[PDB]
Design a protein around this ligand. Structure first.
Ligand SMILES: O=C(O)Cc1ccc(OCc2ccccc2)cc1
Ligand SMILES: [Zn+2]
Length: 258
Protein backbone atom coordinates (compact mmCIF):
# COMPACT_ATOMS: atom_id res chain seq x y z
CA UNK A 1 0.00 0.00 0.00
CA UNK A 2 1.09 3.54 -0.95
CA UNK A 3 -1.43 5.75 0.74
CA UNK A 4 -0.74 9.32 1.78
CA UNK A 5 -2.18 12.80 1.83
CA UNK A 6 -1.36 14.08 -1.70
CA UNK A 7 -3.68 14.54 -4.73
CA UNK A 8 -2.82 11.13 -6.09
CA UNK A 9 -2.87 9.03 -2.89
CA UNK A 10 -4.89 11.04 -0.41
CA UNK A 11 -8.12 10.44 1.50
CA UNK A 12 -10.26 10.45 -1.67
CA UNK A 13 -8.33 7.43 -2.99
CA UNK A 14 -8.18 5.30 0.16
CA UNK A 15 -11.43 3.51 -0.48
CA UNK A 16 -9.93 1.54 -3.40
CA UNK A 17 -7.53 -0.42 -1.20
CA UNK A 18 -9.56 0.04 2.03
CA UNK A 19 -13.30 -0.20 1.20
CA UNK A 20 -14.24 0.38 4.89
CA UNK A 21 -13.30 4.02 4.08
CA UNK A 22 -16.98 4.36 3.10
CA UNK A 23 -18.23 2.40 6.14
CA UNK A 24 -20.79 3.19 8.81
CA UNK A 25 -18.56 4.43 11.64
CA UNK A 26 -15.71 6.33 10.02
CA UNK A 27 -13.66 9.08 11.66
CA UNK A 28 -13.10 11.91 12.03
CA UNK A 29 -16.45 13.72 12.20
CA UNK A 30 -17.72 17.24 12.71
CA UNK A 31 -18.89 17.71 16.30
CA UNK A 32 -22.01 19.82 16.19
CA UNK A 33 -22.18 21.37 19.66
CA UNK A 34 -25.90 22.10 19.36
CA UNK A 35 -26.80 18.45 18.57
CA UNK A 36 -24.44 16.58 20.95
CA UNK A 37 -26.42 15.74 24.08
CA UNK A 38 -25.23 15.81 27.68
CA UNK A 39 -25.21 12.21 28.98
CA UNK A 40 -25.56 12.19 32.77
CA UNK A 41 -24.69 8.49 32.89
CA UNK A 42 -21.09 8.99 31.63
CA UNK A 43 -18.77 8.20 34.55
CA UNK A 44 -15.82 10.44 35.35
CA UNK A 45 -12.81 10.14 32.97
CA UNK A 46 -9.62 8.76 34.56
CA UNK A 47 -6.27 9.59 32.96
CA UNK A 48 -3.58 7.72 34.97
CA UNK A 49 -0.24 8.59 33.36
CA UNK A 50 1.95 8.78 36.53
CA UNK A 51 3.93 5.65 35.63
CA UNK A 52 4.09 6.25 31.86
CA UNK A 53 7.30 4.95 30.24
CA UNK A 54 8.07 6.61 26.91
CA UNK A 55 10.66 4.84 24.78
CA UNK A 56 11.14 6.22 21.34
CA UNK A 57 9.97 8.67 18.71
CA UNK A 58 9.52 7.53 15.10
CA UNK A 59 8.85 9.31 11.78
CA UNK A 60 6.67 6.73 9.97
CA UNK A 61 6.19 8.81 6.79
CA UNK A 62 2.65 9.85 7.82
CA UNK A 63 3.23 11.45 11.25
CA UNK A 64 5.61 10.93 14.16
CA UNK A 65 4.76 8.53 16.96
CA UNK A 66 5.96 8.78 20.53
CA UNK A 67 5.88 5.14 21.66
CA UNK A 68 5.37 3.86 25.20
CA UNK A 69 6.07 0.67 27.08
CA UNK A 70 2.68 -1.07 27.12
CA UNK A 71 3.92 -4.44 28.48
CA UNK A 72 2.09 -3.62 31.80
CA UNK A 73 -0.59 -1.17 33.10
CA UNK A 74 1.80 1.81 33.42
CA UNK A 75 -0.26 4.55 31.71
CA UNK A 76 -3.98 3.87 31.35
CA UNK A 77 -7.25 5.49 30.44
CA UNK A 78 -10.43 4.36 32.26
CA UNK A 79 -13.90 5.67 33.03
CA UNK A 80 -15.94 8.05 30.92
CA UNK A 81 -17.70 5.87 28.33
CA UNK A 82 -15.15 3.06 28.72
CA UNK A 83 -15.57 -0.37 30.26
CA UNK A 84 -12.33 -1.70 31.68
CA UNK A 85 -8.79 -0.59 31.23
CA UNK A 86 -7.10 0.86 28.17
CA UNK A 87 -3.32 0.96 27.94
CA UNK A 88 -1.42 3.88 26.33
CA UNK A 89 0.72 2.65 23.40
CA UNK A 90 1.57 5.81 21.49
CA UNK A 91 0.66 9.38 20.68
CA UNK A 92 0.98 11.39 17.48
CA UNK A 93 -0.43 14.52 15.88
CA UNK A 94 -2.14 15.70 12.71
CA UNK A 95 -1.43 19.22 11.53
CA UNK A 96 -1.75 21.77 8.78
CA UNK A 97 0.27 23.80 6.35
CA UNK A 98 -1.40 26.93 7.82
CA UNK A 99 -2.79 27.67 11.29
CA UNK A 100 -6.40 27.59 9.98
CA UNK A 101 -6.38 23.84 9.25
CA UNK A 102 -4.86 20.67 10.57
CA UNK A 103 -7.28 19.02 12.96
CA UNK A 104 -9.26 15.96 11.91
CA UNK A 105 -12.27 16.48 14.14
CA UNK A 106 -13.97 19.82 13.75
CA UNK A 107 -16.23 21.70 16.18
CA UNK A 108 -19.16 23.37 14.49
CA UNK A 109 -17.03 23.10 11.32
CA UNK A 110 -14.11 24.89 13.04
CA UNK A 111 -10.71 23.42 12.12
CA UNK A 112 -7.91 23.75 14.67
CA UNK A 113 -4.19 24.05 13.82
CA UNK A 114 -3.56 20.50 14.91
CA UNK A 115 -4.88 17.52 16.83
CA UNK A 116 -3.15 15.20 19.29
CA UNK A 117 -4.18 11.52 19.46
CA UNK A 118 -3.26 9.50 22.51
CA UNK A 119 -3.88 5.90 21.46
CA UNK A 120 -4.90 3.26 24.04
CA UNK A 121 -5.87 -0.42 23.66
CA UNK A 122 -8.32 -2.55 25.66
CA UNK A 123 -6.30 -4.88 27.88
CA UNK A 124 -9.08 -7.55 27.79
CA UNK A 125 -7.82 -8.35 24.27
CA UNK A 126 -4.25 -9.02 25.37
CA UNK A 127 -2.43 -7.12 22.61
CA UNK A 128 -2.85 -4.20 20.26
CA UNK A 129 -3.15 -6.36 17.12
CA UNK A 130 -6.06 -8.29 18.62
CA UNK A 131 -7.72 -5.17 20.04
CA UNK A 132 -7.96 -3.44 16.61
CA UNK A 133 -10.16 -6.35 15.38
CA UNK A 134 -12.78 -5.48 18.04
CA UNK A 135 -15.44 -2.75 18.03
CA UNK A 136 -14.33 -1.67 21.51
CA UNK A 137 -10.66 -2.37 21.00
CA UNK A 138 -9.18 1.15 21.16
CA UNK A 139 -9.81 4.38 23.05
CA UNK A 140 -8.28 7.46 21.43
CA UNK A 141 -8.06 10.67 23.46
CA UNK A 142 -8.19 13.59 21.03
CA UNK A 143 -6.87 17.04 21.99
CA UNK A 144 -7.12 20.14 19.82
CA UNK A 145 -4.17 22.49 19.41
CA UNK A 146 -4.56 26.21 18.74
CA UNK A 147 -1.75 28.67 18.09
CA UNK A 148 -1.14 31.14 20.92
CA UNK A 149 1.15 30.72 23.91
CA UNK A 150 3.79 28.00 23.91
CA UNK A 151 3.08 24.65 25.57
CA UNK A 152 6.10 23.98 27.86
CA UNK A 153 5.29 20.28 27.99
CA UNK A 154 5.51 19.98 24.19
CA UNK A 155 8.95 21.54 23.78
CA UNK A 156 10.90 18.29 24.35
CA UNK A 157 8.93 16.82 21.43
CA UNK A 158 9.59 19.87 19.22
CA UNK A 159 13.31 19.77 19.94
CA UNK A 160 13.88 16.14 18.91
CA UNK A 161 12.15 16.57 15.49
CA UNK A 162 15.40 17.65 13.82
CA UNK A 163 16.74 14.13 14.48
CA UNK A 164 13.81 12.30 12.81
CA UNK A 165 13.32 14.50 9.76
CA UNK A 166 12.60 11.72 7.29
CA UNK A 167 10.58 8.54 7.00
CA UNK A 168 11.98 5.61 8.97
CA UNK A 169 14.14 7.72 11.31
CA UNK A 170 13.75 7.18 15.04
CA UNK A 171 15.29 8.51 18.23
CA UNK A 172 15.42 7.45 21.88
CA UNK A 173 12.66 9.37 23.75
CA UNK A 174 12.69 8.28 27.33
CA UNK A 175 11.25 9.99 30.38
CA UNK A 176 8.70 12.12 28.49
CA UNK A 177 5.59 12.91 30.58
CA UNK A 178 2.41 12.96 28.51
CA UNK A 179 0.58 14.74 31.37
CA UNK A 180 2.21 17.96 30.10
CA UNK A 181 0.11 17.77 26.91
CA UNK A 182 -3.28 17.86 28.67
CA UNK A 183 -5.51 20.94 29.05
CA UNK A 184 -6.92 21.90 32.49
CA UNK A 185 -10.41 20.47 31.89
CA UNK A 186 -11.24 16.88 30.94
CA UNK A 187 -14.73 17.80 29.64
CA UNK A 188 -15.20 15.69 26.47
CA UNK A 189 -17.35 14.55 23.60
CA UNK A 190 -17.52 10.84 22.78
CA UNK A 191 -18.73 8.72 19.85
CA UNK A 192 -17.92 5.36 18.17
CA UNK A 193 -15.57 5.58 15.25
CA UNK A 194 -12.48 4.44 13.43
CA UNK A 195 -8.77 4.81 12.86
CA UNK A 196 -8.40 7.96 10.69
CA UNK A 197 -5.60 6.36 8.60
CA UNK A 198 -5.51 3.09 6.68
CA UNK A 199 -6.51 0.44 7.54
CA UNK A 200 -9.38 2.63 8.89
CA UNK A 201 -10.63 -0.06 11.23
CA UNK A 202 -13.87 0.59 13.06
CA UNK A 203 -12.46 -0.21 16.51
CA UNK A 204 -12.23 3.18 18.33
CA UNK A 205 -14.15 4.84 21.14
CA UNK A 206 -13.32 8.48 20.49
CA UNK A 207 -13.01 10.81 23.44
CA UNK A 208 -12.37 14.37 22.23
CA UNK A 209 -11.59 17.02 24.85
CA UNK A 210 -13.51 20.27 24.63
CA UNK A 211 -10.66 22.48 25.87
CA UNK A 212 -7.87 22.90 23.31
CA UNK A 213 -4.25 23.34 24.32
CA UNK A 214 -2.27 26.37 23.15
CA UNK A 215 1.07 25.90 21.38
CA UNK A 216 3.24 28.60 19.84
CA UNK A 217 3.61 29.42 16.18
CA UNK A 218 7.29 28.50 16.58
CA UNK A 219 6.33 25.07 17.96
CA UNK A 220 3.90 24.22 15.12
CA UNK A 221 6.34 25.66 12.53
CA UNK A 222 8.83 22.99 13.61
CA UNK A 223 6.21 20.22 13.01
CA UNK A 224 5.95 21.56 9.47
CA UNK A 225 9.69 21.04 8.80
CA UNK A 226 9.33 17.26 8.95
CA UNK A 227 9.35 15.21 5.79
CA UNK A 228 6.95 12.56 4.46
CA UNK A 229 9.79 11.26 2.25
CA UNK A 230 12.80 9.14 3.22
CA UNK A 231 16.39 10.37 3.41
CA UNK A 232 17.84 11.24 0.00
CA UNK A 233 14.42 11.43 -1.70
CA UNK A 234 12.82 14.61 -3.03
CA UNK A 235 11.57 16.77 -0.13
CA UNK A 236 7.84 16.64 0.57
CA UNK A 237 7.03 18.63 3.69
CA UNK A 238 4.99 16.72 6.30
CA UNK A 239 1.99 19.03 6.35
CA UNK A 240 -1.76 18.54 6.01
CA UNK A 241 -1.62 14.95 7.26
CA UNK A 242 -5.29 15.06 8.32
CA UNK A 243 -8.37 13.27 7.01
CA UNK A 244 -11.44 15.46 6.65
CA UNK A 245 -14.75 14.97 8.40
CA UNK A 246 -16.68 11.79 7.40
CA UNK A 247 -20.45 11.17 7.41
CA UNK A 248 -21.89 10.77 10.91
CA UNK A 249 -24.52 8.31 9.66
CA UNK A 250 -26.37 6.52 12.49
CA UNK A 251 -24.28 7.83 15.42
CA UNK A 252 -24.81 10.20 18.34
CA UNK A 253 -22.07 12.29 19.87
CA UNK A 254 -22.50 12.50 23.66
CA UNK A 255 -21.18 15.33 25.86
CA UNK A 256 -19.76 14.80 29.35
CA UNK A 257 -20.72 18.31 30.36
CA UNK A 258 -23.87 20.47 30.39
O1 LIG B 1 -5.26 8.11 16.25
C1 LIG B 1 -5.38 7.90 15.02
O2 LIG B 1 -5.04 8.61 13.99
C2 LIG B 1 -6.03 6.58 14.79
C3 LIG B 1 -4.98 5.48 14.77
C4 LIG B 1 -4.51 4.87 15.91
C5 LIG B 1 -3.57 3.86 15.81
C6 LIG B 1 -3.10 3.43 14.58
O3 LIG B 1 -2.17 2.40 14.62
C7 LIG B 1 -1.63 1.92 13.38
C8 LIG B 1 -2.24 0.65 12.86
C9 LIG B 1 -3.33 0.04 13.42
C10 LIG B 1 -3.84 -1.14 12.90
C11 LIG B 1 -3.25 -1.72 11.80
C12 LIG B 1 -2.15 -1.11 11.23
C13 LIG B 1 -1.65 0.06 11.76
C14 LIG B 1 -3.57 4.05 13.44
C15 LIG B 1 -4.50 5.06 13.56
ZN1 LIG C 1 -4.34 10.17 14.66
Amino acid sequence: HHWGYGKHNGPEHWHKDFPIAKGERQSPVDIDTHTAKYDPSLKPLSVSYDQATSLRILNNGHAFNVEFDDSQDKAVLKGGPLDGTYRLIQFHFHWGSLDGQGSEHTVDKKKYAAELHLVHWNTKYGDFGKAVQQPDGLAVLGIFLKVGSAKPGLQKVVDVLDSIKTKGKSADFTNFDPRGLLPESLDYWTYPGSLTTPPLLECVTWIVLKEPISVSSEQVLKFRKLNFNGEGEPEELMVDNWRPAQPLKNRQIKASFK
